[model samples]
Target: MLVVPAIDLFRGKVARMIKGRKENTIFYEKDPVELVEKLIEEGFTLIHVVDLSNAIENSGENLPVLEKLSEFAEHIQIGGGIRSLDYAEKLRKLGYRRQIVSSKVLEDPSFLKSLREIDVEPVFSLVTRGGRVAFKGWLAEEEIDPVSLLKRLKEYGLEEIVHTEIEKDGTLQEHDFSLTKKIAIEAEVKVLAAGGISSENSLKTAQKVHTETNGLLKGVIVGRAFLEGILTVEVMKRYAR
Candidate 1:
């Protein structure tokens, strides 16, 4: 599985939001572009970036930063405030390879329909907790079950589903393997798991999800844990090999 580190941008700064709260943010660094360059030098091929300002506000607020990052990394999957087909097209035109449409796809069926008309690959990343779907950056609650949502979206030409557990994200706890493994086993489309992977054992657990589950475990996104030195790119790459 591919290991892509996360570079979440909030207010044009590289920051992390604990439990998905915008106000409860921790500024990691001032220069996200420099961080991307360092990651490239460290042998990271893919980068997962989220425009947190867009995620919370439901608009494309970080386009310029994303556009700048696109110049450096080609294998990038971006999410946050990609609410319309026009926004998706704009980002694609800017050279982003994949766009993640999570909240919008759930909140608006019309937007979902419009999303199907787009040609680029889409990753439907669902953030859930206690068997409930969380939306609007984990502030709003949706009644649909994540598994059922995935099954329904699979028919709409969605390329993959990234199952992220909100409680575990950026916490450095072991992944909720049972949840990820279950989603991988049941979901028909490609599955990528993110959250709570902080050590070598969790990496082994992720690999096991690939082997034991029939689901296509294509890649894993590592962010806070990796940035804090709990999980290194070197260790993850060795295990992936």
Candidate 2:
């Protein structure tokens, strides 16, 4: 399983937030590009970068940071505020291996169709509530059902589903595997689980999801725990081994 570290960019500086809330943010450091290089030095092959500004604005704004990180790493998966075809193409051209599109995909099927033509490996980061896809940073209601979205996108050659429960993210309360397990079974693509992953047990839990779900669970994206010093990269790498 891949333990991807998250680097969230807000106004050109690397920032960390609790439970994905912007007002509750804590600025960790500046020079996010250097942070990625440091993670590379620590032997991480895949890292997830999020543009927090774009996430709230619903437009692309961190292309320069993305371009800088690509020069050093090969497997960079980026998401957060990716809402248009032009933004998707810009990310692809910047050499992002995987593009994670969320709100837009759930809100507009037509926009997703346009993105399909651009990215061969598009991962839909599906936020869930009562087993349905949540929108607007897990703060809005979706008229469409989550299962329906997954089934429909599968025909468009969608590659993976990064499923997360908003209620659990950054809380260290442990992952809702039962929720993930059911979704994994229904999802046609790989389900990369995220949310509330803060310890070795959380990683172990995600690993179990991969095992029981027939390899549909790709991996977990961990951020809060790493930044808060609940789980160090060294300890994580050791646990991974």
Candidate 3:
């Protein structure tokens, strides 16, 4: 199982929003492009980036910054305000072949098909709150089970999924391994688990999920833990491969 870092971008800055709340936002001093370069040099092949401004306020203030990082697109997976097929296409042209779509993809039945038509490999997101799915940039949520949602996306030919426990995100708390493992076991698609991965033991638990599920759980995404050095690139390297 791979251990990937989350590069949460807000207005061209690296930030982390604990609980996905603006009030809980913590901006990092690292330059976004420089940071990605460093991570690549440090042996992390996959980079997970989220455009917080676009995602939260529907703004593309970080588009230029994304373009700079697009040079490493093959190793990057990005999401934020990718609400429509047109925008996804735009990003595809901008060198983002793998895009993560949430709200709009869930709201529209034909969304995933349309995304595939444009050659964008869509990674279905299950940001769960109270066992339901978050929507409309997390302003609202639906009474839906994540496993059920994965079944629907699987039918739509979704190749990958990023299942995150909303309450655990960026909190340095324990991750919901049970739910993630359940999804990994039940779904045929590649599953990436994200939440509060605070220690090596938690990461060990994640790898155990991968082992128990026969590598169904592909990787774990960590932001705050990685940023704070609780989990380092060298640490992730131990799990790489």
Q: Tell me how far the alpha carbon of residue 219 in candidate 2 is from the true structure, in angstroms, after superposition.
A: 1.0
> Candidate 1: minimum summed lDDT over ten consecutive residues — where?
135-144
lDDT per residue, candidate 1, 145-234, as tens digits? 566767777666555877777778767576787777767667666777777766778778778777787537776788888777777767
Enumerate residue pairs that collide in model 1: none
- Which run of 10 residues does model 2 get worst, by summed lDDT? 133-142
Question: Which digits, one per residue and each the tens of the lDDT, describe model 2 over residues 1-241?
Answer: 6788888887767887666777887888557887788788898877888888888765446666777877864667888877878777877777775777876765776666676676536678877755566654443355766666778877766768788776676685887777787777876568777777768898888788778887777678888787777888886676454
Distance from true location, Cα of 13 in model 1, Å: 0.7
Candidate 1 CA-lDDT value: 0.74
CA RMSD of all predictions: 2.9, 2.9, 2.3
Location of the lowest summed lDDT over 10 successive residues in candidate 3? 135-144
Over the stretch 189-236, how does candidate 3's per-residue lDDT look in tens digits? 688888777788788898888999988898988888888787878887
lDDT of each: 0.74, 0.74, 0.83
Number of the top candidate by TM-score? 3
RMSD of 3: 2.3
Off by over 4 Å in 2: 58-61, 130-132, 135-145, 239-241
Clashing pairs in 2: none
What local lDDT score does residue 78 receive in model 3, on the 0 to 100 scale? 94
Task: Report the alpha-carbon TM-score of model 3 versus the true structure.
Answer: 0.93
Better of 1 and 3 by lDDT: 3
